[PDB]
Structure 1
Amino acid sequence: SPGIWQLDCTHLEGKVILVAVHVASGYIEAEVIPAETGQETAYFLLKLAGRWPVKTVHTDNGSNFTSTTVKAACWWAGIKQEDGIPYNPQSQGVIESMNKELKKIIGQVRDQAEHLKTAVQMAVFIHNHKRGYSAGERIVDIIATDIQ
Protein backbone atom coordinates (compact mmCIF):
# COMPACT_ATOMS: atom_id res chain seq x y z
CA SER A 1 0.00 0.00 0.00
CA PRO A 2 2.71 2.68 0.52
CA GLY A 3 3.47 2.82 -3.23
CA ILE A 4 -0.12 2.78 -4.57
CA TRP A 5 -1.55 5.80 -6.39
CA GLN A 6 -4.81 6.45 -8.26
CA LEU A 7 -5.23 8.81 -11.23
CA ASP A 8 -8.36 10.97 -11.36
CA CYS A 9 -9.42 13.38 -14.09
CA THR A 10 -12.03 16.06 -13.39
CA HIS A 11 -13.32 19.06 -15.39
CA LEU A 12 -13.81 22.74 -14.52
CA GLU A 13 -14.05 26.01 -16.54
CA GLY A 14 -13.72 24.08 -19.82
CA LYS A 15 -10.32 22.82 -18.61
CA VAL A 16 -9.04 19.51 -17.33
CA ILE A 17 -7.67 18.89 -13.82
CA LEU A 18 -5.49 15.80 -13.55
CA VAL A 19 -5.12 14.44 -10.00
CA ALA A 20 -2.97 11.71 -8.46
CA VAL A 21 -4.16 10.39 -5.09
CA HIS A 22 -1.99 8.39 -2.71
CA VAL A 23 -4.64 5.87 -1.79
CA ALA A 24 -3.54 5.02 1.77
CA SER A 25 -3.21 8.68 2.89
CA GLY A 26 -5.50 10.80 0.69
CA TYR A 27 -2.51 13.02 -0.23
CA ILE A 28 -2.76 14.53 -3.72
CA GLU A 29 -0.81 16.17 -6.50
CA ALA A 30 -2.69 17.94 -9.33
CA GLU A 31 -2.16 19.91 -12.53
CA VAL A 32 -4.33 21.83 -14.98
CA ILE A 33 -3.96 20.61 -18.59
CA PRO A 34 -5.68 21.66 -21.85
CA ALA A 35 -6.94 18.12 -22.42
CA GLU A 36 -6.23 14.62 -21.08
CA THR A 37 -3.88 13.07 -23.62
CA GLY A 38 -1.55 10.10 -23.21
CA GLN A 39 1.40 12.50 -23.47
CA GLU A 40 0.11 14.82 -20.70
CA THR A 41 -0.66 11.85 -18.44
CA ALA A 42 2.77 10.33 -19.14
CA TYR A 43 4.57 13.58 -18.29
CA PHE A 44 2.50 13.95 -15.09
CA LEU A 45 3.49 10.43 -13.97
CA LEU A 46 7.19 11.08 -14.63
CA LYS A 47 6.96 14.16 -12.40
CA LEU A 48 5.09 12.27 -9.68
CA ALA A 49 7.49 9.29 -9.65
CA GLY A 50 10.54 11.53 -9.30
CA ARG A 51 8.99 13.06 -6.16
CA TRP A 52 7.41 10.05 -4.34
CA PRO A 53 8.08 6.28 -4.48
CA VAL A 54 5.39 5.31 -6.98
CA LYS A 55 5.17 1.50 -7.31
CA THR A 56 1.68 1.05 -8.74
CA VAL A 57 -0.69 3.41 -10.53
CA HIS A 58 -4.38 2.72 -11.02
CA THR A 59 -5.03 4.54 -14.28
CA ASP A 60 -8.15 6.65 -14.61
CA ASN A 61 -9.45 5.26 -17.91
CA GLY A 62 -8.79 2.82 -20.73
CA SER A 63 -7.24 5.34 -23.11
CA ASN A 64 -4.43 6.12 -20.66
CA PHE A 65 -4.12 2.42 -19.78
CA THR A 66 -3.65 1.71 -23.53
CA SER A 67 -1.47 4.75 -24.38
CA THR A 68 1.99 3.81 -25.64
CA THR A 69 3.40 7.04 -24.17
CA VAL A 70 1.88 6.26 -20.75
CA LYS A 71 3.29 2.73 -21.00
CA ALA A 72 6.70 4.21 -21.91
CA ALA A 73 6.63 6.53 -18.88
CA CYS A 74 5.62 3.70 -16.54
CA TRP A 75 8.43 1.52 -17.92
CA TRP A 76 10.95 4.35 -17.55
CA ALA A 77 9.91 5.15 -13.96
CA GLY A 78 9.55 1.54 -12.72
CA ILE A 79 5.78 1.88 -12.25
CA LYS A 80 3.37 -1.05 -12.53
CA GLN A 81 0.41 0.18 -14.53
CA GLU A 82 -2.92 -1.29 -13.44
CA ASP A 83 -6.55 -0.60 -14.26
CA GLY A 84 -8.66 1.69 -12.04
CA ILE A 85 -11.76 -0.50 -11.95
CA PRO A 86 -13.54 -0.03 -8.60
CA TYR A 87 -13.88 -3.70 -7.61
CA ASN A 88 -14.73 -2.16 -4.25
CA PRO A 89 -17.55 0.14 -5.45
CA GLN A 90 -17.08 2.62 -2.55
CA SER A 91 -13.89 3.63 -4.42
CA GLN A 92 -15.86 5.69 -6.97
CA GLY A 93 -17.76 7.58 -4.28
CA VAL A 94 -14.58 8.56 -2.42
CA ILE A 95 -13.08 9.96 -5.65
CA GLU A 96 -16.30 11.79 -6.60
CA SER A 97 -16.42 13.31 -3.08
CA MET A 98 -12.79 14.47 -3.36
CA ASN A 99 -13.50 16.07 -6.74
CA LYS A 100 -16.45 17.95 -5.19
CA GLU A 101 -14.28 19.03 -2.23
CA LEU A 102 -11.52 20.20 -4.59
CA LYS A 103 -13.92 22.21 -6.75
CA LYS A 104 -15.35 23.78 -3.59
CA ILE A 105 -11.88 24.89 -2.45
CA ILE A 106 -11.16 26.20 -5.95
CA GLY A 107 -14.33 28.33 -5.72
CA GLN A 108 -13.25 29.66 -2.31
CA VAL A 109 -9.91 30.99 -3.69
CA ARG A 110 -11.30 32.85 -6.74
CA ASP A 111 -10.81 36.33 -5.26
CA GLN A 112 -7.13 35.40 -4.87
CA ALA A 113 -5.92 33.81 -8.11
CA GLU A 114 -6.29 35.17 -11.64
CA HIS A 115 -5.55 31.77 -13.23
CA LEU A 116 -7.18 28.37 -12.68
CA LYS A 117 -3.81 26.60 -12.45
CA THR A 118 -2.94 28.77 -9.42
CA ALA A 119 -6.28 28.06 -7.73
CA VAL A 120 -5.74 24.33 -8.25
CA GLN A 121 -2.34 24.47 -6.53
CA MET A 122 -3.93 26.44 -3.65
CA ALA A 123 -6.54 23.67 -3.43
CA VAL A 124 -3.81 21.00 -3.37
CA PHE A 125 -2.17 22.92 -0.51
CA ILE A 126 -5.39 23.22 1.51
CA HIS A 127 -6.34 19.57 0.89
CA ASN A 128 -2.94 18.22 1.93
CA HIS A 129 -2.69 20.45 5.04
CA LYS A 130 -6.28 19.92 6.30
CA ARG A 131 -6.43 18.26 9.72
CA GLY A 132 -6.20 14.03 13.80
CA TYR A 133 -3.46 14.20 11.15
CA SER A 134 -3.23 15.74 7.69
CA ALA A 135 -2.86 13.85 4.42
CA GLY A 136 0.69 15.27 4.17
CA GLU A 137 1.53 13.89 7.60
CA ARG A 138 -0.04 10.49 6.79
CA ILE A 139 1.89 9.90 3.54
CA VAL A 140 5.22 10.74 5.19
CA ASP A 141 4.48 8.41 8.15
CA ILE A 142 3.32 5.59 5.86
CA ILE A 143 6.44 5.79 3.68
CA ALA A 144 8.84 6.30 6.62
CA THR A 145 7.36 3.26 8.38
CA ASP A 146 7.89 1.28 5.15
CA ILE A 147 11.58 2.30 4.83
CA GLN A 148 12.33 1.35 8.45
Structure 2
Amino acid sequence: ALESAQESHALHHQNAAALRFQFHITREQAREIVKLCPNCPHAPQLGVNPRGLKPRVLWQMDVTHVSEFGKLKYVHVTVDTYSHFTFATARTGEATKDVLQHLAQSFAYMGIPQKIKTDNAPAYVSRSIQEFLARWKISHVTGIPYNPQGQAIVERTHQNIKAQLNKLQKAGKYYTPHHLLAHALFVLNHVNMDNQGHTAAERHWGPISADPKPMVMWKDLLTGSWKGPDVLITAGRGYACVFPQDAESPIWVPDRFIRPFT
Protein backbone atom coordinates (compact mmCIF):
# COMPACT_ATOMS: atom_id res chain seq x y z
CA ALA A 1 0.00 0.00 0.00
CA LEU A 2 1.00 3.66 0.33
CA GLU A 3 2.98 2.64 3.38
CA SER A 4 5.29 0.57 1.21
CA ALA A 5 5.37 3.28 -1.39
CA GLN A 6 6.56 5.63 1.33
CA GLU A 7 8.99 3.02 2.57
CA SER A 8 10.54 2.64 -0.85
CA HIS A 9 10.59 6.40 -1.28
CA ALA A 10 12.35 6.84 2.06
CA LEU A 11 14.87 4.21 1.01
CA HIS A 12 15.70 5.25 -2.55
CA HIS A 13 13.81 8.51 -2.97
CA GLN A 14 11.97 7.05 -5.90
CA ASN A 15 10.39 9.27 -8.56
CA ALA A 16 6.71 9.96 -7.98
CA ALA A 17 5.99 8.64 -11.48
CA ALA A 18 7.83 5.46 -10.70
CA LEU A 19 5.87 5.12 -7.48
CA ARG A 20 2.68 5.32 -9.48
CA PHE A 21 3.59 2.47 -11.73
CA GLN A 22 5.23 0.41 -9.01
CA PHE A 23 2.51 0.78 -6.43
CA HIS A 24 -0.45 1.44 -8.72
CA ILE A 25 -1.27 4.76 -7.09
CA THR A 26 -2.44 8.13 -8.32
CA ARG A 27 -0.21 11.00 -9.16
CA GLU A 28 -1.47 13.01 -6.30
CA GLN A 29 -0.83 10.17 -3.88
CA ALA A 30 2.68 9.86 -5.24
CA ARG A 31 3.16 13.61 -5.03
CA GLU A 32 2.29 13.63 -1.38
CA ILE A 33 4.71 10.83 -0.73
CA VAL A 34 7.54 12.75 -2.23
CA LYS A 35 6.31 16.10 -0.81
CA LEU A 36 6.59 14.77 2.71
CA CYS A 37 10.23 13.83 2.09
CA PRO A 38 12.40 16.13 4.31
CA ASN A 39 15.39 14.99 2.30
CA CYS A 40 13.86 16.06 -1.00
CA PRO A 41 14.31 19.90 -1.18
CA HIS A 42 10.70 25.30 -8.21
CA ALA A 43 9.82 28.99 -8.00
CA PRO A 44 6.89 30.21 -10.25
CA GLN A 45 5.71 33.82 -10.33
CA LEU A 46 4.20 34.71 -7.00
CA GLY A 47 4.81 38.20 -5.66
CA VAL A 48 4.85 41.48 -7.60
CA ASN A 49 6.53 44.86 -7.18
CA PRO A 50 3.52 47.32 -7.02
CA ARG A 51 3.64 50.91 -8.14
CA GLY A 52 1.97 54.31 -7.90
CA LEU A 53 -1.53 54.88 -9.28
CA LYS A 54 -0.72 58.26 -10.77
CA PRO A 55 2.41 60.45 -11.16
CA ARG A 56 4.06 61.79 -8.04
CA VAL A 57 2.88 59.07 -5.72
CA LEU A 58 5.52 56.42 -5.27
CA TRP A 59 9.09 56.92 -6.32
CA GLN A 60 11.86 54.39 -6.16
CA MET A 61 15.52 55.17 -5.51
CA ASP A 62 18.88 53.41 -5.56
CA VAL A 63 22.43 53.89 -6.84
CA THR A 64 24.73 52.23 -9.33
CA HIS A 65 28.42 52.08 -10.28
CA VAL A 66 29.31 53.67 -13.60
CA SER A 67 33.05 52.89 -13.34
CA GLU A 68 33.62 54.88 -16.55
CA PHE A 69 33.84 58.08 -14.54
CA GLY A 70 35.90 56.90 -11.57
CA LYS A 71 34.55 58.47 -8.39
CA LEU A 72 31.54 59.71 -10.34
CA LYS A 73 30.40 56.07 -10.65
CA TYR A 74 28.08 56.75 -7.70
CA VAL A 75 25.07 57.63 -9.77
CA HIS A 76 21.95 58.25 -7.76
CA VAL A 77 18.76 57.26 -9.52
CA THR A 78 15.09 58.04 -8.86
CA VAL A 79 12.12 56.79 -10.85
CA ASP A 80 8.42 57.65 -10.80
CA THR A 81 6.97 54.19 -10.51
CA TYR A 82 3.71 55.12 -12.18
CA SER A 83 5.01 56.75 -15.31
CA HIS A 84 8.50 55.23 -15.31
CA PHE A 85 9.92 58.74 -15.37
CA THR A 86 13.60 58.61 -14.68
CA PHE A 87 16.27 60.83 -13.14
CA ALA A 88 19.93 60.32 -12.37
CA THR A 89 22.85 62.18 -10.70
CA ALA A 90 26.51 61.20 -11.10
CA ARG A 91 27.85 61.97 -7.63
CA THR A 92 31.27 61.12 -6.21
CA GLY A 93 29.92 59.24 -3.21
CA GLU A 94 26.94 58.10 -1.16
CA ALA A 95 27.16 60.70 1.57
CA THR A 96 24.05 62.25 3.02
CA LYS A 97 24.75 65.35 0.94
CA ASP A 98 25.08 63.26 -2.24
CA VAL A 99 21.73 61.72 -1.59
CA LEU A 100 20.40 65.18 -0.86
CA GLN A 101 22.03 66.65 -3.95
CA HIS A 102 20.26 64.14 -6.08
CA LEU A 103 17.07 64.65 -4.19
CA ALA A 104 17.10 68.42 -4.55
CA GLN A 105 17.71 67.99 -8.21
CA SER A 106 14.94 65.40 -8.46
CA PHE A 107 12.54 67.73 -6.78
CA ALA A 108 13.25 70.25 -9.50
CA TYR A 109 13.38 67.56 -12.21
CA MET A 110 10.47 65.31 -11.24
CA GLY A 111 8.60 67.17 -8.50
CA ILE A 112 7.40 65.57 -5.28
CA PRO A 113 5.89 62.15 -4.35
CA GLN A 114 3.69 61.08 -1.49
CA LYS A 115 6.10 58.26 -0.74
CA ILE A 116 9.44 56.82 -1.81
CA LYS A 117 11.02 53.40 -1.63
CA THR A 118 14.72 52.78 -1.26
CA ASP A 119 16.84 49.85 -0.27
CA ASN A 120 18.02 49.25 3.31
CA ALA A 121 21.36 51.11 2.95
CA PRO A 122 22.49 53.45 5.83
CA ALA A 123 22.51 56.17 3.20
CA TYR A 124 18.71 56.17 3.56
CA VAL A 125 18.31 54.78 7.07
CA SER A 126 20.21 57.69 8.67
CA ARG A 127 18.29 60.00 10.93
CA SER A 128 19.26 62.92 8.70
CA ILE A 129 17.35 61.36 5.84
CA GLN A 130 14.44 60.64 8.07
CA GLU A 131 14.61 64.30 9.11
CA PHE A 132 14.50 65.41 5.52
CA LEU A 133 11.53 63.14 4.88
CA ALA A 134 9.78 64.57 7.93
CA ARG A 135 10.31 68.09 6.61
CA TRP A 136 9.07 67.26 3.15
CA LYS A 137 6.42 64.82 4.45
CA ILE A 138 7.31 61.76 2.39
CA SER A 139 6.75 58.14 3.46
CA HIS A 140 9.76 55.84 3.34
CA VAL A 141 9.79 52.14 2.49
CA THR A 142 13.06 50.21 2.69
CA GLY A 143 11.83 46.77 1.62
CA ILE A 144 13.40 43.43 2.51
CA PRO A 145 17.20 43.56 3.08
CA TYR A 146 19.26 41.72 0.47
CA ASN A 147 16.24 41.25 -1.88
CA PRO A 148 17.15 43.29 -5.03
CA GLN A 149 13.61 42.97 -6.32
CA GLY A 150 12.48 45.68 -3.95
CA GLN A 151 14.37 48.03 -6.27
CA ALA A 152 13.46 46.22 -9.49
CA ILE A 153 12.07 49.31 -11.19
CA VAL A 154 15.21 51.33 -10.80
CA GLU A 155 17.42 48.30 -11.46
CA ARG A 156 15.70 47.73 -14.74
CA THR A 157 16.06 51.45 -15.29
CA HIS A 158 19.77 51.09 -14.59
CA GLN A 159 19.96 48.63 -17.50
CA ASN A 160 18.34 51.24 -19.71
CA ILE A 161 20.51 54.07 -18.50
CA LYS A 162 23.64 52.03 -18.90
CA ALA A 163 22.75 51.02 -22.43
CA GLN A 164 21.78 54.58 -23.29
CA LEU A 165 25.08 55.86 -21.99
CA ASN A 166 26.96 53.25 -23.97
CA LYS A 167 25.25 54.17 -27.21
CA LEU A 168 25.71 57.84 -26.61
CA GLN A 169 29.33 57.52 -25.62
CA LYS A 170 30.07 55.57 -28.74
CA ALA A 171 28.28 58.32 -30.66
CA GLY A 172 30.86 60.97 -29.67
CA LYS A 173 32.81 62.95 -27.08
CA TYR A 174 31.26 64.87 -24.22
CA TYR A 175 32.46 67.89 -22.32
CA THR A 176 31.64 66.28 -18.98
CA PRO A 177 30.25 63.03 -17.51
CA HIS A 178 27.23 65.17 -16.75
CA HIS A 179 27.01 66.29 -20.37
CA LEU A 180 26.68 62.65 -21.34
CA LEU A 181 24.31 61.85 -18.51
CA ALA A 182 22.07 64.82 -19.23
CA HIS A 183 21.97 63.78 -22.86
CA ALA A 184 20.84 60.34 -21.76
CA LEU A 185 18.21 61.71 -19.40
CA PHE A 186 16.91 63.88 -22.15
CA VAL A 187 16.52 60.95 -24.43
CA LEU A 188 15.11 58.61 -21.86
CA ASN A 189 12.24 60.91 -20.95
CA HIS A 190 11.69 63.16 -23.96
CA VAL A 191 12.86 61.20 -27.01
CA ASN A 192 12.18 57.60 -26.14
CA MET A 193 8.54 56.94 -27.00
CA ASP A 194 6.44 53.99 -25.88
CA ASN A 195 4.05 51.77 -27.82
CA GLN A 196 1.17 54.15 -27.12
CA GLY A 197 2.87 57.02 -28.92
CA HIS A 198 3.75 58.87 -25.72
CA THR A 199 6.95 59.81 -23.87
CA ALA A 200 7.90 59.11 -20.26
CA ALA A 201 7.81 62.79 -19.53
CA GLU A 202 4.44 62.99 -21.18
CA ARG A 203 3.19 60.15 -19.01
CA HIS A 204 4.72 61.78 -15.91
CA TRP A 205 2.79 64.94 -16.32
CA GLY A 206 0.31 64.39 -19.09
CA PRO A 207 -3.41 65.22 -19.03
CA ILE A 208 -5.46 63.17 -16.64
CA SER A 209 -6.99 60.37 -18.62
CA ALA A 210 -8.29 56.85 -18.19
CA ASP A 211 -9.75 54.01 -20.21
CA PRO A 212 -12.77 51.87 -19.19
CA LYS A 213 -11.95 48.39 -18.00
CA PRO A 214 -13.65 44.94 -17.94
CA MET A 215 -14.49 42.90 -14.89
CA VAL A 216 -12.22 40.01 -14.02
CA MET A 217 -12.15 37.24 -11.51
CA TRP A 218 -9.48 37.77 -8.95
CA LYS A 219 -7.77 35.04 -6.99
CA ASP A 220 -6.93 35.77 -3.38
CA LEU A 221 -4.03 33.55 -2.28
CA LEU A 222 -4.91 34.12 1.38
CA THR A 223 -8.26 32.45 0.91
CA GLY A 224 -7.41 30.26 -2.04
CA SER A 225 -10.41 31.48 -3.96
CA TRP A 226 -11.70 33.48 -6.88
CA LYS A 227 -13.36 36.73 -5.94
CA GLY A 228 -15.40 39.34 -7.71
CA PRO A 229 -15.75 39.63 -10.65
CA ASP A 230 -14.76 43.26 -10.57
CA VAL A 231 -13.27 45.97 -12.73
CA LEU A 232 -9.56 45.64 -13.20
CA ILE A 233 -7.71 48.95 -12.84
CA THR A 234 -4.67 48.13 -14.92
CA ALA A 235 -2.06 45.64 -15.99
CA GLY A 236 1.18 45.13 -17.82
CA ARG A 237 3.69 42.50 -18.69
CA GLY A 238 3.26 40.03 -15.87
CA TYR A 239 1.12 42.11 -13.52
CA ALA A 240 -2.28 43.54 -12.71
CA CYS A 241 -4.07 45.88 -10.30
CA VAL A 242 -7.65 45.84 -9.05
CA PHE A 243 -9.44 47.76 -6.30
CA PRO A 244 -12.88 46.37 -5.29
CA GLN A 245 -15.60 48.19 -3.38
CA ASP A 246 -15.17 45.80 -0.48
CA ALA A 247 -11.37 46.04 -0.46
CA GLU A 248 -9.39 48.11 2.01
CA SER A 249 -6.68 49.16 -0.45
CA PRO A 250 -5.61 48.61 -4.11
CA ILE A 251 -4.57 45.10 -4.93
CA TRP A 252 -1.39 44.35 -6.79
CA VAL A 253 -0.82 40.81 -8.07
CA PRO A 254 0.78 38.96 -10.99
CA ASP A 255 -1.50 38.78 -13.99
CA ARG A 256 -1.69 35.01 -13.78
CA PHE A 257 -4.23 35.49 -11.01
CA ILE A 258 -6.60 37.29 -13.40
CA ARG A 259 -9.45 35.53 -15.18
CA PRO A 260 -11.44 37.89 -17.45
CA PHE A 261 -15.09 37.56 -16.60
CA THR A 262 -17.72 37.00 -19.26
Which one has the largest radius of gyration? 2
Question: What is the 5 A alignment of 1:69-108?
Answer: 69-85=128-144, 92-108=151-167
- Whole-angstrom distance in 2 between the partners of 1:81 and 1:6: 10
Could you tell me which residue of structure 2 aligns to residue 24 of structure 1? 82
SS at match of 2:113: coil
Residue 84 of structure 1, CA deviation: 4.0
For the Cα contact (< 8 Å) 2:114–2:137, is it kept in 1? yes
Identity %: 24
For the Cα contact (< 8 Å) 2:60–2:118, is it kept in 1? yes
Question: What is the 5 A alignment of 1:2-17?
Answer: 2=54, 3-12=57-66, 13=68, 14=70, 15-17=73-75
Pick which of 53-62 and 21-30 moved more: 53-62
Deviations 1:78-134 (A, max 9, x none): 211211449x98665543332122112112222141321211111111111211211
Deviations 1:17-72 (A, max 9, x none): 11100001110111110011222113322343355132101013321331122112
For the Cα contact (< 8 Å) 1:60–1:84, is it kept in 2? yes
| Number of residues of Structure 1 aligned to a counterpart in Structure 2 | 143
Q: Which runs of 5+ in 1 are unaligned?
A: none
* Equivalent position amino acid for 1:128 in 2: N
Q: Which runs of 4+ in 1 moved over 6 A?
A: none
Q: Which runs of 5+ in 2 are unaligned?
A: 1-51, 210-262
Q: Answer 1 or 2: which has greater helix percent.
A: 1
* Equivalent position amino acid for 1:40 in 2: D
Q: Which has the higher contact order (CA 8 A, sep 6+)?
A: 1
Q: CA-atom RMSD, angstroms?
A: 2.5
* Equivalent position amino acid for 2:208 in 1: T
- Whole-angstrom distance in 2 between the partners of 1:89 and 1:40: 22
Relative distance call for 1:22 and 1:71 in structure 2 (3 A) is same
TM-score (structure 2 length as normaliser): 0.49
* Equivalent position amino acid for 1:35 in 2: G
- Whole-angstrom distance in 1 between the partners of 2:93 and 2:154: 20
- Whole-angstrom distance in 2 between the partners of 1:25 and 1:77: 22
Pick which of 116-125 and 50-59 moved more: 50-59
* Equivalent position amino acid for 2:164 in 1: I
TM-score (structure 1 length as normaliser): 0.81
